[PDB]
Design an enzyme around this catalytic site. Structure first.
Site, short mmCIF file in Angstrom:
data_model
loop_
_atom_site.label_atom_id
_atom_site.label_comp_id
_atom_site.label_asym_id
_atom_site.label_seq_id
_atom_site.Cartn_x
_atom_site.Cartn_y
_atom_site.Cartn_z
N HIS A 80 17.99 74.78 1.54
CA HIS A 80 17.05 73.90 0.88
C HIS A 80 16.15 73.23 1.89
CE1 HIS A 80 20.29 73.45 -2.49
NE2 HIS A 80 19.70 74.63 -2.51
C1 LIG Z 1 20.64 82.09 -0.14
C2 LIG Z 1 19.78 81.02 -0.80
C3 LIG Z 1 20.35 80.25 -1.82
C4 LIG Z 1 19.58 79.23 -2.48
N1 LIG Z 1 20.10 78.71 -3.66
C5 LIG Z 1 19.32 77.82 -4.38
C6 LIG Z 1 19.77 77.32 -5.66
O1 LIG Z 1 21.03 77.70 -6.10
N2 LIG Z 1 18.97 76.49 -6.37
C7 LIG Z 1 17.77 76.14 -5.90
O2 LIG Z 1 16.91 75.26 -6.66
N3 LIG Z 1 17.32 76.57 -4.74
C8 LIG Z 1 18.05 77.43 -3.93
N4 LIG Z 1 17.46 78.08 -2.85
C9 LIG Z 1 16.36 77.42 -2.16
C10 LIG Z 1 14.97 77.51 -2.85
O3 LIG Z 1 14.81 78.76 -3.42
C11 LIG Z 1 13.85 77.30 -1.85
O4 LIG Z 1 13.85 76.01 -1.35
C12 LIG Z 1 12.51 77.51 -2.56
O5 LIG Z 1 12.42 78.83 -2.99
C13 LIG Z 1 11.37 77.21 -1.58
O6 LIG Z 1 10.28 78.07 -1.95
P1 LIG Z 1 8.97 78.11 -1.02
O7 LIG Z 1 7.73 78.30 -1.85
O8 LIG Z 1 8.79 76.79 -0.31
O9 LIG Z 1 9.06 79.29 0.04
P2 LIG Z 1 9.82 80.63 -0.23
O10 LIG Z 1 10.48 80.68 -1.55
O11 LIG Z 1 10.95 80.74 0.72
O12 LIG Z 1 8.82 81.87 -0.07
C14 LIG Z 1 7.97 81.94 1.08
C15 LIG Z 1 7.33 83.29 1.13
O13 LIG Z 1 6.40 83.35 2.22
C16 LIG Z 1 6.63 84.59 2.90
N5 LIG Z 1 6.22 84.56 4.26
C17 LIG Z 1 6.73 83.85 5.29
N6 LIG Z 1 6.05 84.13 6.43
C18 LIG Z 1 5.04 85.07 6.12
C19 LIG Z 1 3.96 85.79 6.87
N7 LIG Z 1 3.76 85.58 8.26
N8 LIG Z 1 3.14 86.66 6.21
C20 LIG Z 1 3.30 86.88 4.90
N9 LIG Z 1 4.26 86.26 4.16
C21 LIG Z 1 5.15 85.35 4.75
C22 LIG Z 1 8.06 84.85 2.73
O14 LIG Z 1 8.30 86.27 2.73
C23 LIG Z 1 8.36 84.34 1.40
O15 LIG Z 1 8.23 85.37 0.44
C24 LIG Z 1 18.27 78.99 -2.12
C25 LIG Z 1 17.69 79.78 -1.07
C26 LIG Z 1 18.45 80.79 -0.42
C27 LIG Z 1 17.78 81.64 0.73
#
Ligand SMILES: Cc1cc2nc3c(=O)[nH]c(=O)nc-3n(C[C@H](O)[C@H](O)[C@H](O)COP(=O)(O)OP(=O)(O)OC[C@H]3O[C@@H](n4cnc5c(N)ncnc54)[C@H](O)[C@@H]3O)c2cc1C
Ligand SMILES: Cc1cc2nc3c(=O)[nH]c(=O)nc-3n(C[C@H](O)[C@H](O)[C@H](O)COP(=O)(O)OP(=O)(O)OC[C@H]3O[C@@H](n4cnc5c(N)ncnc54)[C@H](O)[C@@H]3O)c2cc1C
EC number: 1.-.-.-
Lengths: 649, 649
Positions: free
Chosen positions: B575
């Site tokens: 998280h």
């Molecule tokens: C194993 C695991 C369990 C979790 N369990 C839970 C849960 O039970 N409940 C819950 O609410 N949350 C949980 N989460 C956490 C939650 O999903 C994340 O905090 C949330 O998805 C954050 O999303 P985000 O938009 O900030 O970035 P992200 O969801 O992480 O996505 C970022 C995207 O940007 C891409 N990216 C990064 N760098 C580059 C680049 N240089 N070029 C192109 N693309 C790039 C990545 O590939 C990714 O697809 C969990 C996460 C994991 C990994």
């Protein structure tokens, strides 16, 4: 753009040396691509004590092998033989690769492993002149401080060596075939001659000695500088600040901060190479004659796989578009070394203890090592090669250091503080380490710190329903690493107990107690070996023995309790290699099977791990690659008074 | 090469929603760049039980968060507060980012945290409608199976809340201001109404319930599908197989396997983006209006830093050529949640223990969670916010699952086997986790799995020479994570003690005992709290207490021993966020301070961690980003019966 005849990917122990002599001995344009840059002006690298954290900021106190600015962070997949742990093993990123960040212990590996485990054309006599070249180019030094504990230990190993010879047994850990009946242990008489574990002819396969050989040189002011592949072959005498070769080396061009992506092919001929420069812009390098990959054990197969060489079925499945040659062995057969740790407590008058442990402090000429030996198989290891009784194999690298070498969590649990003035470390490093692993890219786009690296160590045997006799040969093979690790403990236990004698004989009012793993557990093990003999290890699998004695349940329990220690009380060596070995990914001439003009010349090409640390073999392989590419023995036949001249800047 | 008006980097929880709704509400050319690809046809992702390894090959049995084919492997620097450990934390790599690989527990985070810890303009009433959109687009379901143990735990919590209300005390962990004197615990009578922790008005800050809400939908054949950011917003109804938009979404373009390297600037204005495609070739995309980074908490600051935005002195020191704006705060202020694990053993007749533990098996509608609550501060926690008694803060997310949730090494040391039919897991997740860390690139060239990620948790306080009175306020702030973690143990202890009552009341002839950590230690802890009161945590630093009584050395000893357990008997959550938070790296309108046209719209922009899992908050941010860019409340005002339509392929 750049155009070259030979393109070398990775300026590690193999690449640096390869690039240097290729430019000298030919008029071809040599292009060397490196992911990092030179660290000639960085005291963390050029001061050998930088390895131990002399220049670490107190808030970001991390070693070079933990630091993405100095290295690749190869985080492996969960170790099923070690509670799912995910150790991170490094490759140095910079001029000289991992020699830029290693502990500088230079070790050939001995005659036997090359005579027996490498193919024809790569036998010890085919490689010894190249090893000699790798050594004199570094010109390593011995320990400048004699410690009393070293001699007491050597005198202890001598007594054991005499008992093993006198017993007439075929195989044991201090026996050495090439020295016959004379215990091959350095003497402790006042002007005794040092025993050289890297001796030119390979006589000293099993040998006990007072000093290893460290990769440092002394400067005129008395300080020591790191003498690694980086500054030996790519210093300013040979390569200028713009990366252009000088003089006889002017055909050489060294590109810094150049991360290679793929090898580009036309048919099965490589014609170009991708790389991203320091600004993040991609460039193309045109290739006229050959491509040599020397990117380390973790990352050379990833370059080949990203390039279209590997399991087509797998490579397609993660999105490699351009497939070139289908060879499922690319990235397989990954080997390493493994160091389980032991701690010893010294009992007696504080002043007498302080005296016994004096002179062990790490300085550049010893890097902490105060001994001791390259050892052979324990007489009770069921997994010896067939001819172990007619030729002497290296099995253990025995090292003695000051301090407490277990991880912090083990320090908490064992109660053993790194600040007690009465503890020291003995390590019996398995250098014929049974486990085998493999490497697979997870994505096709870019080189990553973390491909899939599978490497399972101390796994368990699950009993089946088959008759016991049909199961033991499978279990013997599965338990091979647990068996070797525990027997290494017994070797240290034996040593410690003779030291109890040879310490008094040398006038020290002390006695020694092995305290990690538990003294109590190790004693039971030693006894177990004498009571149950050759088949003691059957008790790793208690249900198939059917010994329902109080004594039998107890020894089975002891092996269970001890199996814990090599899992968490150890340090995985950073000696990974063999992932593209001769006969599997490349042929005897280091050419990648299936291609016209691609070679592999680093430790990933090695047929079998050398008996000792791996730097020397890596540079040796790249060195032979020089003569293979030029078609004449230029490097083998170069006189030994002709060495690179050191330029510190 | 390509041209767009808005370029979005990363199709994560934020990126997917932002790209979807930007395309719908504008005539701009929207280009979405994603490093991974869609997994709409991968049963490991689209079947919810794939998270638990349903389709795992038995020889490579690893979860998606361990697999470089599914994720970035963020190996952090050695944890100075956990014996040097280097946990590997993942971001999902593909359509839907981490929602593609997570455990699907959708939790808004509650009102208080936005009313008190986020800036003006981001208060709960400013963001609540966007959260509502995020939930109805997913439409999560509740647990399909009632288990007796849930009701037993709930009835025990009810008793505890009543004591807390009756006592008249200002702050404790089951008190909830918005519901006054009525214990905010779901009833266990036959046709009781459920408590919704995500209730629209944020009434349920502290609340106990029987079910969380899971990101799954039911298909017509009875099977469940994963309902994540990827297939909710980017499925085949909206984006065709070539990544081009459909109908009203034709302005959208989605590029798969596009790993972005840097943002290109002219002045402090972004004019382009470079990326590497799956063939290993770099492309340039022209930017007409804005660039939005939604690449996750680990990698959003790394893209900015590689682009020239951050600490200039440092970025120079590692070789970044083109500097753009100097902000040393870029990448700083990284937060996470942390879950120490407790194990409980149930005693009694095997048939009666089995009945008490029935119906706890994970299936898609619960993902293993059988409760239980969002809880407030423990009364003896000294680090409450100033207004902790006038508004109810969320501090622990209490979760109960089947099986044994400690690491394998810990199962061995404790003797607590995952196959014992009489153990279950209780977790008090610190969702106001005190530690703060930071992210820095190690090299300027390429995006890497492993930048320098410093995050030190349960550090120790080292006493100085100053008088005690000057040190305690420092020691109080240093020891904050240890203090809260331990109090979490006591909260569970209290619950278990009441569950012993409520289990009999419900006709279960069983008894419950906390066995990980040791029952004796937690018992000693509970007595210690009543004996020494508010200043109990002083005994973390016994030399400053000058209490040399047997009772005192013993309590100090009890705490030293308990400090072990949150460090190694736990799981660091995925998280991570706040590394480019509002007010530090970006302003209130999500614009990167120092640029004309760059925004951050993922969880790295978050001002403070939500009181609960982080998926919802992440998409919530992406949602305002839609409105902030277009200049109209299109999304805030879209009716809730207008939802994205699910297409499975
Ligand atoms: C194993 C695991 C369990 C979790 N369990 C839970 C849960 O039970 N409940 C819950 O609410 N949350 C949980 N989460 C956490 C939650 O999903 C994340 O905090 C949330 O998805 C954050 O999303 P985000 O938009 O900030 O970035 P992200 O969801 O992480 O996505 C970022 C995207 O940007 C891409 N990216 C990064 N760098 C580059 C680049 N240089 N070029 C192109 N693309 C790039 C990545 O590939 C990714 O697809 C969990 C996460 C994991 C990994
Ligand atoms: C911490 C540590 C301690 C060790 N201790 C010792 C010791 O005491 N004694 C000893 O004999 N050996 C030791 N070694 C091992 C020894 O240094 C190595 O075995 C030796 O360097 C291996 O040679 P190599 O050329 O195959 O690999 P490397 O030296 O690691 O060569 C790899 C080079 O290729 C570059 N590279 C990798 N991928 C790419 C890419 N995609 N594009 C461009 N360039 C790339 C890397 O940057 C690196 O420079 C240790 C190693 C480490 C890391």
């Amino acid at each position: 753009n750049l155009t070259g005849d030979i393109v070398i990917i990775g300026a590690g122990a193999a690449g640096s040396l390869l690039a240097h002599y290729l430019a000298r001995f030919s008029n071809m344009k040599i292009i060397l691509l490196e992911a990092g840059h030179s660290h000639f002006n960085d005291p963390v690298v050029t001061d050998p004590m930088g390895f131990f954290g002399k220049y670490n900021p107190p808030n970001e106190n991390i070693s070079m092998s933990q630091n993405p600015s100095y290295s690749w962070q190869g985080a492996q997949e969960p170790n099923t033989g070690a509670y799912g742990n995910r150790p991170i093993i490094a490759h140095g990123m910079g001029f000289g690769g991992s020699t830029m960040i290693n502990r500088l212990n230079l070790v050939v590996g001995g005659r036997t492993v090359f005579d027996n485990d490498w193919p024809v054309g790569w036998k010890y006599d085919d490689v010894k002149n190249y090893f000699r070249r790798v050594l004199v180019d570094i010109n390593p030094v011995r320990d400048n401080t004699k410690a009393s504990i070293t001699s007491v230990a050597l005198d202890a190993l001598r007594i054991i060596a005499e008992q093993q010879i006198a017993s007439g047994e075929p195989v044991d850990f201090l026996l050495n075939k090439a020295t016959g009946n004379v215990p091959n242990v350095e003497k402790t008489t006042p002007d005794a001659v040092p025993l050289n574990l890297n001796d030119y002819e390979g006589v000293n396969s099993v040998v006990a000695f007072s000093s290893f050989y460290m990769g440092v040189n002394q400067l005129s002011d008395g300080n020591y500088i790191r003498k690694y592949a980086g500054n030996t072959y790519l210093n300013r005498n040979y390569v200028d600040e713009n990366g252009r070769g000088i003089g006889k080396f002017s055909g050489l061009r060294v590109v810094s901060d150049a991360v290679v992506d793929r090898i580009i092919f036309k048919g099965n001929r490589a014609v170009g190479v991708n790389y991203i420069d320091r600004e993040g812009i991609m460039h193309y390098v045109k290739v006229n004659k050959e491509v040599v990959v020397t990117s380390g054990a973790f990352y050379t197969p990833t370059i080949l796989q990203r390039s279209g060489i590997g399991d087509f079925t797998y490579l397609s499945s993660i999105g490699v578009k351009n497939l070139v040659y289908n060879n499922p062995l690319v990235g397989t057969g990954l080997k390493n070394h493994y160091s389980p740790v032991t701690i010893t407590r010294v009992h007696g008058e504080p002043s007498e203890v302080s005296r016994f442990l004096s002179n062990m402090a790490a300085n550049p000429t010893n890097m902490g090592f105060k001994g001791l030996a390259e050892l052979g198989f324990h007489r009770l290891d069921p997994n010896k090669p067939a001819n172990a009784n007619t030729v002497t194999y290296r099995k253990y690298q025995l090292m003695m250091t000051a301090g407490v070498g277990i991880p912090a969590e083990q320090q908490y649990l064992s109660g053993l503080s790194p600040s007690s003035n009465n503890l020291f470390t003995l390590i019996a490093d398995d250098i014929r380490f049974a486990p085998e692993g493999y490497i697979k890219i997870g994505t096709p786009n870019i080189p990553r710190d973390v491909p899939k690296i599978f490497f399972n160590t101390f796994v368990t045997y699950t009993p089946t329903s088959a008759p016991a006799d049909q199961q033991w040969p499978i279990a013997q093979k599965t338990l091979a690493p647990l068996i070797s690790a525990l027997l290494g403990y017994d070797i240290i236990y034996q040593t410690l107990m003779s030291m109890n004698q040879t310490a008094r004989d040398s006038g020290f009012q002390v006695s020694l107690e092995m305290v990690y793993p538990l003294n109590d557990l190790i004693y039971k093990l030693h006894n177990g070996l004498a009571t149950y003999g050759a088949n003691w290890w059957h008790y790793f699998v208690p249900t198939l023995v059917g010994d329902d004695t109080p004594a039998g349940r107890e020894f089975a329990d002891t092996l269970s309790k001890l199996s814990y220690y090599p899992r968490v009380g150890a340090h995985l060596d950073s000696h990974q290699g063999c992932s593209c070995s001769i006969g599997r990914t490349v042929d005897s001439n280091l050419k990648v099977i299936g291609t016209q003009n691609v070679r592999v010349a680093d430790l990933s090409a090695a047929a079998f791990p050398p008996g000792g640390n791996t730097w020397a073999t890596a540079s040796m392989i790249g060195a032979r690659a020089v003569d293979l590419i030029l078609g004449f023995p230029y490097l083998r036949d170069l006189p030994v008074n002709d060495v690179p001249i050191l330029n510190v800047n």
